[PDB]
Write a protein that binds this DNA or RNA. Sequence first.
RNA 1: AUGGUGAACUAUGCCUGAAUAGGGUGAAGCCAGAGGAAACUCUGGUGGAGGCUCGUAGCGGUUCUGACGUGCAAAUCGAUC
RNA 2: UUCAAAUGAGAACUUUGAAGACUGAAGUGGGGAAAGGUUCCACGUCAACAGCAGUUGGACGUGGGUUAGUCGAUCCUAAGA
RNA 3: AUAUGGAUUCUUCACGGUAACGUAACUGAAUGUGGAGACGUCGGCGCGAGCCCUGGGAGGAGUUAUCUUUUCUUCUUAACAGCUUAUCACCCCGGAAUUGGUUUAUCCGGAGAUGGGGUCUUAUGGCUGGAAGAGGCCAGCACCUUUGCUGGCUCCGGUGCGCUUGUGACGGCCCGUGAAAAUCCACAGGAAGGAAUAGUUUUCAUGCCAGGUCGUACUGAUAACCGCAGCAGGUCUCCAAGGUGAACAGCCUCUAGUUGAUAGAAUAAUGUAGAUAAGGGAAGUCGGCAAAAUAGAUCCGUAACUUCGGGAUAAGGAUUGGCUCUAAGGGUCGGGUACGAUCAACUUAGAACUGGUACGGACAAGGGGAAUCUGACUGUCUAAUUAAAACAUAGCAUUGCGAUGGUCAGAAAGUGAUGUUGACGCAAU
Lengths: 91, 77, 112, 50, 100
Amino acid sequence: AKRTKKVGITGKYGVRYGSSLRRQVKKLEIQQHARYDCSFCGKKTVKRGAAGIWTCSCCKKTVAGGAYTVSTAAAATVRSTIRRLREMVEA
Amino acid sequence: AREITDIKQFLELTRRADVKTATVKINKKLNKAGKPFRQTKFKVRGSSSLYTLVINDAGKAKKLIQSLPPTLKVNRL
Amino acid sequence: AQRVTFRRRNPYNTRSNKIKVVKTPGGILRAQHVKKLATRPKCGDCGSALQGISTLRPRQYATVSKTHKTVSRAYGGSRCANCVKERIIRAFLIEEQKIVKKVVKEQTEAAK
Amino acid sequence: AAQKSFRIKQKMAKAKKQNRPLPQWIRLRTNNTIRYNAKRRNWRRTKMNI
Amino acid sequence: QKIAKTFTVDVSSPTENGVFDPASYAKYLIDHIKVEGAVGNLGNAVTVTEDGTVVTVVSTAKFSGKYLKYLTKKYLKKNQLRDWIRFVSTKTNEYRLAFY
RNA sequence: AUGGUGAACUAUGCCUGAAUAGGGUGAAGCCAGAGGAAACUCUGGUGGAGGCUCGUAGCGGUUCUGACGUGCAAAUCGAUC
RNA sequence: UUCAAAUGAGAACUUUGAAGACUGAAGUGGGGAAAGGUUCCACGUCAACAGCAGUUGGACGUGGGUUAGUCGAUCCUAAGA
RNA sequence: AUAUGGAUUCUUCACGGUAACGUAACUGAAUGUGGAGACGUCGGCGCGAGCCCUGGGAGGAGUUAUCUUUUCUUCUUAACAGCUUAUCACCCCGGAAUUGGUUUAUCCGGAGAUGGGGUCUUAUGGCUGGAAGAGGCCAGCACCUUUGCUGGCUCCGGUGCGCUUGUGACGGCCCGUGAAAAUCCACAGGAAGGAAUAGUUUUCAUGCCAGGUCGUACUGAUAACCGCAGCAGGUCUCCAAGGUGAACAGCCUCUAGUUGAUAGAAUAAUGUAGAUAAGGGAAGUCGGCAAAAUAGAUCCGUAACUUCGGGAUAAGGAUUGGCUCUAAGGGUCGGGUACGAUCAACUUAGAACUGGUACGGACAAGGGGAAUCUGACUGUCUAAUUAAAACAUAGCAUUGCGAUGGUCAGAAAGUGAUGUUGACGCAAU
Ligand SMILES: [Mg+2]
Ligand SMILES: [Mg+2]
Ligand SMILES: [Mg+2]
Ligand SMILES: [Mg+2]
Ligand SMILES: [Mg+2]
Ligand SMILES: [Mg+2]
Ligand SMILES: [Mg+2]
Ligand SMILES: [Mg+2]
Ligand SMILES: [Mg+2]
Ligand SMILES: [Mg+2]
Ligand SMILES: [Mg+2]
Ligand SMILES: [Mg+2]
Ligand SMILES: [Mg+2]
Ligand SMILES: [Mg+2]
Ligand SMILES: [Mg+2]
Ligand SMILES: [Mg+2]
Ligand SMILES: [Mg+2]
Ligand SMILES: [Mg+2]
Ligand SMILES: [Mg+2]
Ligand SMILES: [Mg+2]
Ligand SMILES: [Mg+2]
Ligand SMILES: [Mg+2]
Ligand SMILES: [Mg+2]
Ligand SMILES: [Mg+2]
Ligand SMILES: [Mg+2]
Ligand SMILES: [Mg+2]
Ligand SMILES: [Mg+2]
Ligand SMILES: [Mg+2]
Ligand SMILES: [Mg+2]
Ligand SMILES: [Mg+2]
Ligand SMILES: [Mg+2]
Ligand SMILES: [Mg+2]
Ligand SMILES: [Mg+2]
Ligand SMILES: [Mg+2]
Ligand SMILES: [Mg+2]
Ligand SMILES: [Mg+2]
Ligand SMILES: [Mg+2]
Ligand SMILES: [Mg+2]
Ligand SMILES: [Mg+2]
Ligand SMILES: [Mg+2]
Ligand SMILES: [Mg+2]
Ligand SMILES: [Mg+2]
Ligand SMILES: [Mg+2]
Ligand SMILES: [Mg+2]
Ligand SMILES: [Mg+2]
Ligand SMILES: [Mg+2]
Ligand SMILES: [Mg+2]
Ligand SMILES: [Mg+2]
Ligand SMILES: [Mg+2]
Ligand SMILES: [Mg+2]
Ligand SMILES: [Mg+2]
Ligand SMILES: [Mg+2]
Ligand SMILES: [Mg+2]
Ligand SMILES: [Mg+2]
Ligand SMILES: [Mg+2]
Ligand SMILES: [Mg+2]
Ligand SMILES: [Mg+2]
Ligand SMILES: [Mg+2]
Ligand SMILES: [Mg+2]
Ligand SMILES: [Mg+2]
Ligand SMILES: [Mg+2]
Ligand SMILES: [Mg+2]
Ligand SMILES: [Mg+2]
Ligand SMILES: [Mg+2]
Ligand SMILES: [Mg+2]
Ligand SMILES: [Mg+2]
Ligand SMILES: [Mg+2]
Ligand SMILES: [Mg+2]
Ligand SMILES: [Mg+2]
Ligand SMILES: [Mg+2]
Ligand SMILES: [Mg+2]
Ligand SMILES: [Mg+2]
Ligand SMILES: [Mg+2]
Ligand SMILES: [Mg+2]
Ligand SMILES: [Mg+2]
Ligand SMILES: [Mg+2]
Ligand SMILES: [Mg+2]
Ligand SMILES: [Zn+2]
């Protein structure tokens, strides 16, 4: 029983604020409430716990990350650049 | 505050230096489902706790009661 | 029917003024105040309520024999046993690998 | 009130002590002149501002 | 498991004052005590008698002593006798009619 | 004009407390089913979202331009909200 | 709201008994915080006061009453001073 | 303050258990470290307590023309102590696809599930001690008195989407993630100190002394406070019975408390507050102001337009008492390694009968529709003539600033706000 055509979680907000504003929010809520894969123990048990703080159900590891997502695209490309640059200074 | 059952361990208490008073209480009570009998509680007032030794048996009772220190100030009933 | 009143002067429902109803040998209801609950001490290591250890309010721990405040093994009343298992292993291995990195870089200094 | 400080009880005290009518034997002294107690106060007529 | 229950009433004190007739009284009992329904179903399940100056009631069916005080009050109220005679318990389950 | 006294009312911040019948709606998440060549669509339940809604206490103060208008009252009372 | 008795110089109004009603446990019930400060209680008692009354009162007179190792304060720290 | 008993020691500073851990004890300085104190909010689920309902018996009361094995009521157990008790957590055995276990709510397992067996917290409950000697209810004698004296009984149950409160394991929410300190404990550490002719031990037991100072009355409000007052105003909070009903609503009642508010006689006009009115139906009026209409619930039906969430109880309908039947929805036991037996619940739907066609019978309880103007919304204000279209808001855009700074405070300053701050920031429109 598909419950709404399209507002998804954004249903709570009813008719208020206007479509576009709600669209934008649905995107980022779907991001934050979602359950993620833990890099450390392999199980998908990382849920968010306040802006920026991602911690793991079992094994209890907490990783700092994006405000509503585990890994922000920015930091990702940073990670690689720090890889790259570190490479140079041992070889 | 405390209840007691080792009938020797009790006897020792009744002579435990600070024990001036004691009291013997008798109660009608029932048995299993039918008849009644005669419960009897032996209460030694310590300085910090009041010890009470239930003797269920009326026979054990009488003989116990005589053994009570002949210096001890026991209140009967 | 029967109702009831606070017993301290404080009229308000604050944490320290929990109440609890009760029937007396008089055959009547009366309030009784209930101290805020103990919480179980926690393994300061993994964080779990740690087992074998009795649970009081903090000052009331001075009114109790030490066998309510420990379990036998090392880091007894303090960490969570499984936590100590880790400690033991990690300590051993690391102290060993310590030696292996010694004689390996000790070899290098002579082999170069 | 209900749970007062001593400073207030004390004051309260001294207050009820003054709360009496003229001793009638004063009315008898030579050229006594005081006819009644003019400084008589009463809880529901005049409050004593602590 | 079945159990019999006797029930005594010392009707003496107000019988020995004329105003009480035990006669038509156990009569009141014998045909108004109801049994799993109605009157006179006492199918040797309950019995009433009169040791001269006593009434004896022995049940095997549902019969409480409260019911006994209840019946007699009706009798007593029926025959004007309330004002002068209480139904009272003395010893447990042994009842008596009191005069004054 | 000079020097003083007020945040017991009230405005705003902070600190530490306390309070709020019963209803209507049924958002994410989850289970089970159905159709379809496929892509995918669909059904029934479960759940309990919301500066959501009906409405008391609460807070408010719309209208009668009602009462009163030498008042119960130097702002109150009713009903309506 | 009512009938009667008591008491009193005097009783629509005090006391007791009777009746009829109300508040309806979100109280016209049982306690407390702030504020009051003796209003509590008893005895006596009506000049004034309770916008009729009064024998009654939160009035007038005269006395009595507030008992803590554990309930609060006291100790700690908050905004802040 | 301190001794006595116990424990400990010739292997000096306890044993036992594979283990989670056990215990009546079982040395421990500096120093370090950990815990507790200590923490949001809502939701359902689970459990406790008290309340509510109820069967049996034992009493006392009320009604008895008539009827009712009846109507009312009593039947209670403190802190504190002993044994015992737990969802969670954890340990041992074991090695899992045919994946299993599993909550109302989909979470868990090779980082070891399911299973079988243990360990722990003691909220909480149980049984005993306290403690029946108390308290509750009766009966039977005594006498101006103090007031006694004497006996009895005070027992066994049942039910739950109940009510209120407490609590647990969970889940939802955040650009919001929801004090502090005193204080108490524990651990790591091992400085020291300590026995065989006799040591060590007061976190085991028992024993001895002491705990000062101030507040404690009462009111807490239609008369004890603030409003000049015994003012229809104002003024923080806990406890909370039965019916009807969704209900802490309204209406009636038990307990408790009131019966206070000048009084008598009449019932003109005009009033204030409550109601009704034939026929018409907004013609009244600035204006339907006022008032009437509507209303609960079950079922059926529901338009434009839309940001797809709504609009919507749209609109528009029918139905509803009493009584008597019927069907469906549960719990618990024993079954070698298909059924039976009983216990206890109002929910829902259907079917008859029945009446002056009445039935949400009082109470309770939305008028609807089509548009124009205007503010998006919820929220805000002129206490005491303006609640609005005014303010705010999210959203949009502009400005200033890299700290030797922006903006702002001060008479000054070894001064201050932002700032526990750093452009995803602060300040200013
Ligand atoms: Mg009752
Ligand atoms: Mg008190
Ligand atoms: Mg709270
Ligand atoms: Mg333990
Ligand atoms: Mg332990
Ligand atoms: Mg005043
Ligand atoms: Mg203020
Ligand atoms: Mg609610
Ligand atoms: Mg409704
Ligand atoms: Mg609501
Ligand atoms: Mg198919
Ligand atoms: Mg909801
Ligand atoms: Mg709202
Ligand atoms: Mg609303
Ligand atoms: Mg309603
Ligand atoms: Mg109001
Ligand atoms: Mg408001
Ligand atoms: Mg007007
Ligand atoms: Mg006028
Ligand atoms: Mg008004
Ligand atoms: Mg309203
Ligand atoms: Mg009168
Ligand atoms: Mg009434
Ligand atoms: Mg009500
Ligand atoms: Mg009143
Ligand atoms: Mg009081
Ligand atoms: Mg006062
Ligand atoms: Mg005085
Ligand atoms: Mg008085
Ligand atoms: Mg006079
Ligand atoms: Mg006066
Ligand atoms: Mg007067
Ligand atoms: Mg007069
Ligand atoms: Mg006086
Ligand atoms: Mg204290
Ligand atoms: Mg002090
Ligand atoms: Mg040992
Ligand atoms: Mg610390
Ligand atoms: Mg801490
Ligand atoms: Mg706090
Ligand atoms: Mg206690
Ligand atoms: Mg198990
Ligand atoms: Mg085992
Ligand atoms: Mg349920
Ligand atoms: Mg409440
Ligand atoms: Mg949290
Ligand atoms: Mg601890
Ligand atoms: Mg040294
Ligand atoms: Mg000790
Ligand atoms: Mg000192
Ligand atoms: Mg008091
Ligand atoms: Mg009063
Ligand atoms: Mg004044
Ligand atoms: Mg007033
Ligand atoms: Mg009163
Ligand atoms: Mg008046
Ligand atoms: Mg008149
Ligand atoms: Mg007409
Ligand atoms: Mg018409
Ligand atoms: Mg027309
Ligand atoms: Mg016209
Ligand atoms: Mg106009
Ligand atoms: Mg109108
Ligand atoms: Mg009409
Ligand atoms: Mg419409
Ligand atoms: Mg019908
Ligand atoms: Mg059935
Ligand atoms: Mg049909
Ligand atoms: Mg608006
Ligand atoms: Mg609004
Ligand atoms: Mg105004
Ligand atoms: Mg003005
Ligand atoms: Mg408005
Ligand atoms: Mg206005
Ligand atoms: Mg604006
Ligand atoms: Mg725009
Ligand atoms: Mg300087
Ligand atoms: Zn992980």
